Amino acid sequence: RQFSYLIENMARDCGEYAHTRYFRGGMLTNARLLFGPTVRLPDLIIFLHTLNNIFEPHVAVRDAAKMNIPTVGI
Amino acid sequence: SNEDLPISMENPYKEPLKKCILCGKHVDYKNVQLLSQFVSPFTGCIYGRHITGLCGKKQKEITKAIKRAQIMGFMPVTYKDPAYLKDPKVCNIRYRE
């Protein structure tokens, strides 16, 4: 949360997207229902923080591998 | 190669291991003034190592010495000799408050 503001601004500055909020189950593995059938998922996910707030791996790390999305992580 | 690489060494900043108050001293059964420092003043019960702060080896020397001094006619059992009530308190126990 400390860096949530900074990351969101950079994404807008570089014409890219961000998700620093609570990850609702299904963003990636169920995008068709949530967004629509013709939705286009990310081609690259950059993890600035791979852990969540209870010191466990972010769910998107595992969900991005299921959707064959390459991940970059610190 | 490089000379800035670290070297295999034991921790020099390590602090010496802590010692109990009775470390290096001889615990005799005739020193009732020292044995009364580890017993309750009202019941005469022997205190534990969480109160006395002694080590396992010295806590058993006080216990063995108290039991021997009690049955020999050197130390009371049901109470603490009033003479040793104004001695330095080393045990972590507060009754009144």
């Binding site: - | 108050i21 020292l34 001695d87 330095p88």
Partner: protein, 48 residues
């Protein structure tokens, strides 16, 4: 070295000849084995 030290001590040992004299000396002096300890680890000898 232990034998040499013991050889000196044996002289002081009580004997039948000096038994009566030693008893009187014991009845005049006193030995105190009592000493307390503080929280710092210091021995507090009794002021007697």
């Amino acid at each position: 070295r232990e034998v040499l030290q013991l050889q000196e001590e044996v002289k002081n040992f009580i004997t039948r000849e000096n038994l009566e004299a030693r008893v009187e000396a014991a009845l005049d002096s006193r030995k105190n084995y009592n000493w307390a300890i503080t929280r710092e680890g210091l021995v507090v000898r009794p002021q007697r």
